[PDB]
């Protein structure tokens, strides 16, 4: 009636993606982690843009939208900030936000690539991803056009807006050979082999294995720059464990109060 003892095995770890394998867990627990990578992992992203002069050919909201999608390195800050709606302040704080500032005027004759080099932060640690490969083009200005704005980055997760989504793509997979026949091929040999298939080039799918559950879920979490790919994971495990602890506290209050 009790818990299971999952085991992890990182196969590849770079600074852009992690490939691990989780064994001995349920498919629901392994898929619910996959969803926590995408939505509920906090990250810093520009979310408040005050435009003082915009004379580019793009809009006013086209700039602000393209600025929200610029990934900012949240890595130890993001767990010290508060959500904006919970800061006991009036008009953003250093303790719930990070302030940015873009001031660009094209004076020369060639066109200006306003890139994210121009976004100057007030904290040295939350910067757009420029640290160590070009930069995210924001606009191109002509001679005489300009852009001054100041912006604010707050904490959030990918369930509100996708801009707060820390991943490029999560590649979940389980049971590479159709051993459980969770999928049923009409012609099983037209199908290419998985990357993880422990199968020879002779046979097409594994023979049917009647009593058997999924384990060995293979993951490949790829970061967008904002968090490091093993911090996305360690944070999704803690974010899930915290949703559950909160549910349990509210449950014990509902039980004792009935």
């Amino acid at each position: 009636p009790y818990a299971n003892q999952p085991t992890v095995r990182i196969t590849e770890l770079t600074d852009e993606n992690v490939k691990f394998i989780i064994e001995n867990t349920d498919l629901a627990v392994a898929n619910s982690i996959r969803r926590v990578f995408i939505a509920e992992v906090p990250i810093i992203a520009i979310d408040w843009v005050q435009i003082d002069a915009n004379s580019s050919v793009l809009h006013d909201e086209f700039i602000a939208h393209r600025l929200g999608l610029i990934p900012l390195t949240s890595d130890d800050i993001v767990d010290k900030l508060q959500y904006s709606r919970d800061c006991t302040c009036e008009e953003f704080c250093p303790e719930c936000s990070v302030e940015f500032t873009l001031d660009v005027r094209c004076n020369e004759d060639q066109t200006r690539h306003v890139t994210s080099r121009d976004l100057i932060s007030n904290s040295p640690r939350v910067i757009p991803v420029t640290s160590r490969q070009d930069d995210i083009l924001i606009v191109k200005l002509r001679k005489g056009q300009e852009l001054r704005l100041r912006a604010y980055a707050k904490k959030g997760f990918g369930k509100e807006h996708a801009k707060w989504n820390p991943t490029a793509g999560v590649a979940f997979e389980y049971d590479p050979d159709n051993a459980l026949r969770h999928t049923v091929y009409p012609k099983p040999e037209e199908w290419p082999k998985s990357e993880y298939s422990e199968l020879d080039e002779d046979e097409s799918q594994a023979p049917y294995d009647p009593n058997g559950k999924p384990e060995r879920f293979y993951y490949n979490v790829e970061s967008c720059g904002s968090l490091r790919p093993e911090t996305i994971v360690l944070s999704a495990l803690s974010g899930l464990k915290k949703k559950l602890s909160d549910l349990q506290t509210q449950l014990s209050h509902e039980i004792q109060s009935d």
Binding site: D134, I136, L137, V139, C224, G225
Partner: peptide
């Protein structure tokens, strides 16, 4: 009009690759 910042489907930053490409 101008290269999107991210891939719509995936999430991956493609805004810095138009000049390189």
């Amino acid at each position: 009009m101008i290269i999107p910042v991210r891939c719509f489907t995936c999430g991956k930053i493609v805004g810095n690759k138009w000049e390189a490409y």
